[PDB]
Amino acid sequence: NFNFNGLTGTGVLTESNKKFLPFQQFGRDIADTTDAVRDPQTLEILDITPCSFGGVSVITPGTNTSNQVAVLYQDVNCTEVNVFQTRAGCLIGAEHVNNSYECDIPIGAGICASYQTSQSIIAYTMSLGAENSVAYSNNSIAIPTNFTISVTTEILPVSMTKTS
Amino acid sequence: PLSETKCTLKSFTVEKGIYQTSNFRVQPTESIVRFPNITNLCPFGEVFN
Amino acid sequence: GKIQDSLSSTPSALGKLQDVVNQNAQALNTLVKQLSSNFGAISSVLNDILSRLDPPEAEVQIDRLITGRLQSLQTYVTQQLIRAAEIRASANLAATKMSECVLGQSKRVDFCGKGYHLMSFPQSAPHGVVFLHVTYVPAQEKNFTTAPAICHDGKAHFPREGVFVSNGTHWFVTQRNFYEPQIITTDNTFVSGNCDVVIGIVNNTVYDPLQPELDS
Amino acid sequence: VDCTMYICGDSTECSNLLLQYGSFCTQLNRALTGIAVEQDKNTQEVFAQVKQIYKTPPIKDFGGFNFSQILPDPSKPSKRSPIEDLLFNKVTKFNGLTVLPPLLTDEMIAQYTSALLAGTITSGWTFGAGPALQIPFPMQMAYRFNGIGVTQNVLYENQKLIANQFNSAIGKIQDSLSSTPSALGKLQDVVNQNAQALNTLVKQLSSNFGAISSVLNDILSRLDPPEAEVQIDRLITGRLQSLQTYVTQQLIRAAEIRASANLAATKMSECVLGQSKRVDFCGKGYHLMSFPQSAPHGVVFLHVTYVPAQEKNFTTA
Ligand SMILES: *[C@@H]1O[C@H](CO)[C@@H](O[C@@H]2O[C@H](CO)[C@@H](O[C@@H]3O[C@H](CO)[C@@H](O)[C@H](O)[C@@H]3O)[C@H](O)[C@H]2NC(C)=O)[C@H](O)[C@H]1NC(C)=O
Ligand SMILES: *[C@@H]1O[C@H](CO)[C@@H](O)[C@H](O)[C@H]1NC(C)=O
Ligand SMILES: *[C@@H]1O[C@H](CO)[C@@H](O)[C@H](O)[C@H]1NC(C)=O
Ligand SMILES: *[C@@H]1O[C@H](CO)[C@@H](O)[C@H](O)[C@H]1NC(C)=O
Ligand SMILES: *[C@@H]1O[C@H](CO)[C@@H](O)[C@H](O)[C@H]1NC(C)=O
Ligand SMILES: *[C@@H]1O[C@H](CO)[C@@H](O)[C@H](O)[C@H]1NC(C)=O
Ligand SMILES: *[C@@H]1O[C@H](CO)[C@@H](O)[C@H](O)[C@H]1NC(C)=O
Ligand SMILES: *[C@@H]1O[C@H](CO)[C@@H](O)[C@H](O)[C@H]1NC(C)=O
Ligand SMILES: *[C@@H]1O[C@H](CO)[C@@H](O)[C@H](O)[C@H]1NC(C)=O
Ligand SMILES: *[C@@H]1O[C@H](CO)[C@@H](O)[C@H](O)[C@H]1NC(C)=O
Ligand SMILES: *[C@@H]1O[C@H](CO)[C@@H](O)[C@H](O)[C@H]1NC(C)=O
Ligand SMILES: *[C@@H]1O[C@H](CO)[C@@H](O)[C@H](O)[C@H]1NC(C)=O
């Protein structure tokens, strides 16, 4: 918590590269939030970045399979908090495995989690599907010789309960 | 964390997935009151001395 | 039968309708809970405010409750109007799907389920509709060599329906979605141009059904 | 947006006063979470229409059709086509307002559009319905022409001309997007409206709403509880009304974006995974094919259509 000459508020003060004019006492961001201050005794410019915060999300398989969970602290470092730093946040409790698989619990920024054989929670960069290549060539065509009839189910809501 | 998830979902069974259960903050450690340097001190000298 | 097993086994199959029920229930449950909030008033229960305070100040606390509960209703109604717009969009989609998949055979790709649409069946469901979309999916395929055209007398014959395929030694013409080779004849192909323009034309023999009859 | 940090950030007295309003903040957080989830559903529905990731061969002989301006450029750092690079280069957490990463990052979305392009190019529309069945591109176009009532021979006899017209038209797309600032207004408007909504929401913290000061600590540092609570309730009402306005506007805009995403998913299904016969659905003319490209917060389709150009007066019967 800082009080620079009646300007008040919580944050982390760090050494800045900003060049205030001799008479300006505090830098303000685009939307009128204080971004930097002049320390009144040593006339140096400090940036104010707000104190780290974010949601805490619990990544779990179901309580029908396991009571082991991983916790994601969103959009922060793994210093303020088997710890895996991801773009989505700091993931604690999941193991990092490089081989990709289909996303099971999405975490974010490409990272998904799952419960796999240990039999532990893992995190990985999701696979988008099995890779393929169509054996293209200028004189070759693939033609089906057999077929299946499939039935798919499309479920749509039509109405709400008529509350009055 | 698992009990927090159960309380958030109001259930003793939690389905597979990711659930937001709380909000983490980094609490202010020190209250720093830093202020300008002290100059133009009032002429109590003359009156008193 | 697989649809029956699929829908029964996983309970989540109808989540798209269950969510709507849940959201409406949550929408009302919150609204009912909002009656217990003070919104700054001395008590959330109106009858204790009237029974405890004289008019000039009880009216102030009651106005505080009126603002809070009216704003709560405005929130509920706004959320219901937006959710109703979502459901209206779903209902309009369902009516379009009923028109085009059930009352017809849609040619809109993936409108009426993956594959090539053959037909659909509605089924009712609480607060919504479930369509069983019956589609044709090609399932086994083979590598054939192909050509855009064939040369027979210097004229280029192009298939009238389907494509030319080769099983390695012979050329056939076949319907594009199901391997069914036919002998290439003048009733399977049409003639346009000649051999010196088409890139990829291959030499072949086109059978003329009339000649055997004229000799016979 | 964290309603409690936004309204009553790092103030216990204010938080205790906010708790007298019951469910308003949990409801706002729930609505914003629902929107945030929906945006990943929107991206999934638009782009994850292919189960497998298809690739074109190293041989690019497609009968003269030059797709090098839509196909991924391996040389660059993020495997994007040049047109995708123009689109990305052409589009421009404090108080509890935070931004979540999208589930599918730009590289994965580029991979999905690459899979869709390789599928379209090497198997026509068959990768959409079922197994992706290879067909030579000039034969795919022969089907695409036959699909609009133009006999196959028109492509084959005019293949070189058609391939050159296609390549020229794509180059013109490159120039059109490159030189005109306004081509991507539809996505820039979305970015701008969200930025304006959040700058407005943050600026609302500076309003008094009838209170002596917009700064919560200056009320707490000046006034004794029984009256500072009145001023704080004034600020809570104003700031909560500000969040309700923001969230309602976001819900309505999200409904608009959902409609756009549903249209984009329909267009990918019917224009990219097939050959639409819906007039002006897949651009003016008669639809032959279309190509997805990723773009920040949206999708750009290149619709390739047949337009008659020169005509003659015949007598008929
Ligand atoms: C009236 O005059 C007297 C003496 O001239 C003042 O008293 C002096 O006050 C100063 C205040 O800074 C004292 O200085 C001290 O010096 C020591 C070491 O020299 C240092 O460690 C301290 O931190 C402090 O700076 C000084 O000792 C003291 N002298 C006496 C005899 O009291 C008095 O302050 C004057 N009147 C007013 C109203 O100031
Ligand atoms: C206040 O005193 C310090 C000595 O520690 C000095 O360096 C500083 O310059 C003074 N204040 C100003 C505004 O100069
Ligand atoms: C999940 O729960 C069902 C009953 O609800 C049970 O039959 C099943 O065994 C559980 N799953 C596992 C992996 O045990
Ligand atoms: C914060 O995270 C970045 C990477 O996201 C890392 O480079 C940096 O060292 C971290 N800082 C702290 C203090 O943890
Ligand atoms: C892949 O996983 C192994 C652990 O088995 C690890 O040593 C290696 O560094 C990982 N590769 C990368 C690129 O992180
Ligand atoms: C086609 O598949 C069915 C089962 O899906 C099989 O019974 C039938 O023999 C197959 N036909 C051919 C020609 O392979
Ligand atoms: C067609 O041939 C390619 C290689 O020439 C092969 O990868 C592909 O599996 C073949 N198609 C089928 C249906 O086996
Ligand atoms: C057969 O193909 C050759 C090209 O190698 C061509 O010169 C010849 O004219 C073709 N035959 C006929 C009957 O067109
Ligand atoms: C191709 O089909 C013809 C039918 O006329 C048959 O005689 C020939 O043996 C077949 N060749 C192959 C490789 O299947
Ligand atoms: C196909 O490409 C090969 C080279 O890979 C070339 O020799 C041949 O002439 C081409 N054929 C057609 C029909 O384009
Ligand atoms: C057209 O294709 C050729 C390869 O055949 C390639 O070298 C050229 O760069 C392509 N055109 C453009 C504008 O990239
Ligand atoms: C067809 O005839 C009309 C006469 O009314 C003329 O205006 C038009 O230009 C003619 N079209 C062409 C293509 O010459």
Author numbering:
A (entry chain C): 540 to 620, 641 to 676, 689 to 735
B (entry chain C): 295 to 343
C (entry chain C): 932 to 1147
D (entry chain A): 736 to 827, 854 to 1078
Quote the study that presented this structure, word for word.
(A) Cryo-EM structure of the C1C-A3–Fab SARS-CoV-2 spike protein complex. A3 binds the RBD core with the spike protein trapped in the three open RBD conformation. The trimer model shown was generated by superposition of an RBD–C1C-A3 Fab model generated by subparticle classification of the RBD region onto the coordinates of the trimeric spike protein–C1C-A3 Fab complex. In agreement with competition assays, A3 interacts with RBD residues that overlap significantly with those of CR3022. Although the A3 and S309 footprints on the RBD do not overlap, and S309 (a class 3 antibody) can bind the closed spike protein trimer, both antibodies contact the N-linked glycan attached to N343RBD but approach it from different faces. Among A3, C6, and A6, only A3 competed with binding of an ACE2-Fc fusion protein, suggesting that A3 blocks cellular attachment. A recent molecular dynamics study suggests that introducing the glycan at N370RBD in SARS-CoV-2 would favor the closed conformation with the N370RBD glycan stabilizing the closed RBD structure on the trimeric spike protein. A lack of a glycan at position N370RBD, therefore, may increase SARS-CoV-2 ACE2-binding and infectivity by favoring the open state but may also make SARS-CoV-2 more vulnerable to neutralizing antibodies that can only bind the RBD in the open conformation.
